[PDB]
Design a protein around this nucleic acid. Structure first.
Ligand SMILES: [Mg+2]
Ligand SMILES: [Mg+2]
Ligand SMILES: [Mg+2]
Ligand SMILES: [Mg+2]
Ligand SMILES: [Mg+2]
Ligand SMILES: [Mg+2]
Ligand SMILES: [Mg+2]
Ligand SMILES: [Mg+2]
Ligand SMILES: [Mg+2]
Ligand SMILES: [Mg+2]
Ligand SMILES: [Mg+2]
Ligand SMILES: [Mg+2]
Ligand SMILES: [Zn+2]
Lengths: 122, 48, 86, 69, 164, 116, 54
RNA sequence: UCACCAGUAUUAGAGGCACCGCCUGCCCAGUGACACAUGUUUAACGGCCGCGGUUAACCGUGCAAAGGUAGCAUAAUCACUU
RNA sequence: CCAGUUGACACAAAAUAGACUACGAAAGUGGCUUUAACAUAUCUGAACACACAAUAGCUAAGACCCAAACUGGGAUUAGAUACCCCACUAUGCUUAGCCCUAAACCUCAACAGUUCAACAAAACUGCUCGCCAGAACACUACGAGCCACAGCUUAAAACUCAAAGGAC
């Protein structure tokens, strides 16, 4: 199956980020995967002052490393990411485009109550 | 009730919101200030 | 703690009319859904009592919505004696 | 409906609990005596089986341990 | 238990992947597949080995093979994390259904039943008659009864041999 | 918008759970909720506070804290007038909600028909 | 209920009854031992006699 | 840095009881030990009550620490005691 | 060494969506990622059996923000051993073993199909497992069985009754 790495790093210079990306890609390939794509939202502001062992930072990127890792390896990869020091956090979620959307067509007209009480004059 | 989405669509939207909040792609206790340019999507009762 | 300090829940005030900003903040908190949460967190809500509270709230909300719909639908008839025949 | 049957049941249960609390050591002694009598009856039944099963003197090499510690 | 290098079932019919980039051929493999793919491959292998009418999925042989594969999967699951007792209940129900299907097949056909038993390997053992639920007392009573039976048999043999 | 409510009651066909256990039958009654009234609030707080501050600064003479006592008395008179105006409007015009008698008569003109 | 349950259980039974005098003795021959007295329950009130017969 | 020690709080020294099972109920007025900012310690030394009533509960009460709780019973248990 | 901003910051769970019926045989389960997956394209079928199973209580394994039975006191009534408050032992928990209870009640059994005594959820047609046909005695004694020893499953017998019981 397909997967995607939600790598979130800080503004820790260019060569350090490149080395961390290379390490992550090497680990993913050693685990039995194939690099699909490499994207990033740029070292922009963070949603909140977050720590990453153990300083506070407000500027970090959101690198996206797509891959095709096996089935029984997601937990191991998450543990490896948590073990890393330079990596803030990030849960490895399966590829989003792989989930075949169930063709829905807006809301349907919900009918009124279909009999809920007896018929008695009371 | 106010937003007006379907079951599956609203479920997916809230799941994505929660994933972004946990992983770190969206502020939890407030809205992302770097992306405020958004038309009146929902009927914001407050502030009229 | 780990979130930005002064950004949210910052209802500005002006014209020396704090009552307006107070009502605005109250409306914001009520529409957000936390005043009742804090009021119930004042003490421990038992799971049984918590489920009963949620069920009663849902029932009252459905009833209020139905009544509001009926009112919006039947508010037309409010004249007096249009026919006067009897 | 009214809670009369269940209230009476709870009252009877409370009475039984008070009974057990006031007296329990004599009940334990009676239980020990009952266990001893059961063991004696089992031994007598085994002896009767040995006697009526053709052979006698009980098979050799067999052991009849006592159950209930 | 197919090797970890064979192709899948639905992907083997189409020749698009047989001659394509190596990345796609490596991705569409058992080593990179899921559990359902391995189960389907095992079912197809068993059908081609034992069942003389492949791709049936209607008769009793295919259903029995599917039930056996499901029981194997439930066993592999219960291997780790044994506390999941709902899966144990599902496994027991599947074993009961497989026993019922085997009984039906034997009642309908005996040669085919023996062939399927020799192929799959699931031995046909008769079920226990009554479930009296033996206890320590009854267990020791039965043991003593068997011992006394052996002893009296030996005694009767000796008595018979007494006459020269 | 009216939310869903099919799989919420304990009915025959319904194979789900009764997440909504209404203590009373859901039958739109011919009456409406009554609007609250009266509440021990004791108005006049700012004038009371400023009068207390003035009396603390001075003693208890009426000629000293006249500037504050006049405003306090004016606010008390205004509170009495507002109470009278509210008591009068309770029968003339009700703020917020409408007169329950109007909806009562409206429902009497076209009451419910649940029993067919 | 179903017919299988009624067949496995079977028809009902007619158990016997027994008053004080076992072996069915409507007219017994007892010996007097005492001639004490006894009162009725709450509603009824009296001081009727009660003898201890064997 | 002669043992206690070439050991380290799960380690050693000074004591009460008697494995295992049900339990160890109350009291620092007094003595001892804790400067524990005036209190702790009873598995420390020691103690767990009296007068009149429809063969007794519950009333009127006096004093302190409680006023013997559970349990066992003519005891290796003051004559009563054979 | 207490009340209010900031800095290294909880072995318990996720708020608005929860104004959704979603998944399980039942209890039950909703902030995200995963290892596996929910038998039956004929149905019912064991409380002589197999799997178990809210919480509750126990033996160790650490303690927690909070609470924590009994406990100490404060105002309290002739009396409070309760209704208001402060702290706490086992405990609400997992890491290792259990016992096997419930208002486990949605007190409406499973399968395919159709248009009333009163409260309630209007009636049922064909088939199937279990249970009952008086109340206290009787979530009991006696049996039997259980890692459970003041426990648990089935479970009565004599006496009293003119009754017990559900709905309006
Ligand atoms: Mg009721
Ligand atoms: Mg379990
Ligand atoms: Mg003592
Ligand atoms: Mg003596
Ligand atoms: Mg936890
Ligand atoms: Mg259960
Ligand atoms: Mg606390
Ligand atoms: Mg208490
Ligand atoms: Mg604790
Ligand atoms: Mg339940
Ligand atoms: Mg059946
Ligand atoms: Mg049954
Ligand atoms: Zn939707």
């Amino acid at each position: 199956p397909r997967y995607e790495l939600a790598l979130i790093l800080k503004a820790m210079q260019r060569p350090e980020t490149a080395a961390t990306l290379k390490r992550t890609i090497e680990a993913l390939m050693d685990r039995g995967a194939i690099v699909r794509d490499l994207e990033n939202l740029g070292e922009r502001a963070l949603p909140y002052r977050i720590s990453a062992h153990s300083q506070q930072h407000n500027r970090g990127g959101y690198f996206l490393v797509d891959f095709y890792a096996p089935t029984a390896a997601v937990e191991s990869m998450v543990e490896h990411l948590s073990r890393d020091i330079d990596v803030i956090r990030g849960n490895i979620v399966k590829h989003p485009l792989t989930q075949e959307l169930k063709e829905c067509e807006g809301i349907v007209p919900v009918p009124l109550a279909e009999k809920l009480y007896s018929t008695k004059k009371r | 009730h106010i937003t007006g989405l379907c079951g599956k669509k609203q479920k997916e939207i809230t799941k994505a919101i929660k994933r972004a909040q946990i992983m770190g792609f969206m502020p939890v206790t407030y809205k992302d200030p770097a992306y405020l340019k958004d038309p009146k999507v929902c009927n914001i009762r407050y502030r009229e | 703690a780990k979130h930005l300090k002064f950004i949210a829940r910052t209802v500005m005030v002006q014209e020396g009319n704090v009552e307006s900003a107070y009502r605005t903040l109250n409306r914001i908190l009520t529409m957000d859904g936390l005043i009742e949460d804090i009021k119930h967190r004042r003490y421990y809500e038992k799971p049984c009592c918590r489920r009963q509270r949620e069920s009663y709230e849902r029932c009252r909300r459905i009833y209020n919505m139905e009544m509001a719909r009926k009112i919006n639908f039947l508010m037309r008839k409010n004249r007096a004696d249009p026919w006067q025949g009897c | 409906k009214n809670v009369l049957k269940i209230r009476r049941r709870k009252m009877n249960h409370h009475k039984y609990r008070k009974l057990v609390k006031k007296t329990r050591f004599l009940r334990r002694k009676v239980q020990e005596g009952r266990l001893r009598r059961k063991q004696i009856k089992f031994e007598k039944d085994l002896r009767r089986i040995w006697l009526k099963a053709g052979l006698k003197e009980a098979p050799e090499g067999w052991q009849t341990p006592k159950i209930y510690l | 238990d197919p090797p970890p290098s064979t192709l899948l079932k639905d992907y083997q019919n189409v020749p698009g992947i047989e001659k394509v980039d190596d990345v796609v051929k490596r991705l569409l493999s058992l080593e990179m597949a899921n559990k359902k793919e391995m189960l389907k491959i095992k079912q197809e292998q068993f059908m081609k080995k034992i069942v003389a009418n492949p791709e049936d999925t209607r008769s009793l042989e295919a259903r029995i093979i599917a039930l056996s594969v499901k029981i194997r999967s439930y066993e592999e699951h219960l291997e780790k994390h044994r506390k999941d007792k709902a899966h144990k209940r599902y496994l027991l129900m599947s074993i009961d259904q497989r026993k019922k299907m085997l009984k039906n097949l034997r009642n309908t056909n005996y040669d085919v039943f023996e062939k399927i038993c020799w192929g799959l390997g699931i031995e046909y053992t008769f079920p226990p008659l009554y479930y009296r639920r033996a206890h320590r007392r009854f267990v020791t009573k039965k043991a003593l009864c068997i011992r006394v039976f052996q002893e009296t048999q030996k005694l009767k043999k000796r008595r018979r041999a007494l006459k020269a | 918008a009216t939310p869903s409510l099919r799989g919420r009651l304990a009915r025959f066909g319904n194979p789900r759970k009764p997440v909504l256990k209404p203590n009373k039958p859901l039958i739109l009654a011919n009456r409406v909720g009554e609007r609250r009234r009266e509440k021990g609030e004791a108005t006049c707080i700012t004038e009371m506070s400023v009068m207390m501050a003035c009396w603390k600064q001075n003693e208890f003479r009426d000629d000293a804290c006249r500037k504050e006592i006049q405003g306090f008395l004016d606010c008390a008179a205004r509170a009495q007038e507002a109470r009278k105006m509210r008591s009068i409007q309770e029968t003339l015009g009700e703020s917020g909600s409408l007169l329950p008698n109007k909806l009562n008569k409206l429902l009497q003109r076209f009451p419910n028909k649940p029993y067919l | 209920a179903t017919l299988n349950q009624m067949h496995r259980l079977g028809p009902p039974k007619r158990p016997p009854r027994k008053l004080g005098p076992t072996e069915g003795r409507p007219q017994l021959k007892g010996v007097v031992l005492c001639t004490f007295t006894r009162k009725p329950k709450k509603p009824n009130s009296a001081n009727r006699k009660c003898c201890r017969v064997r």
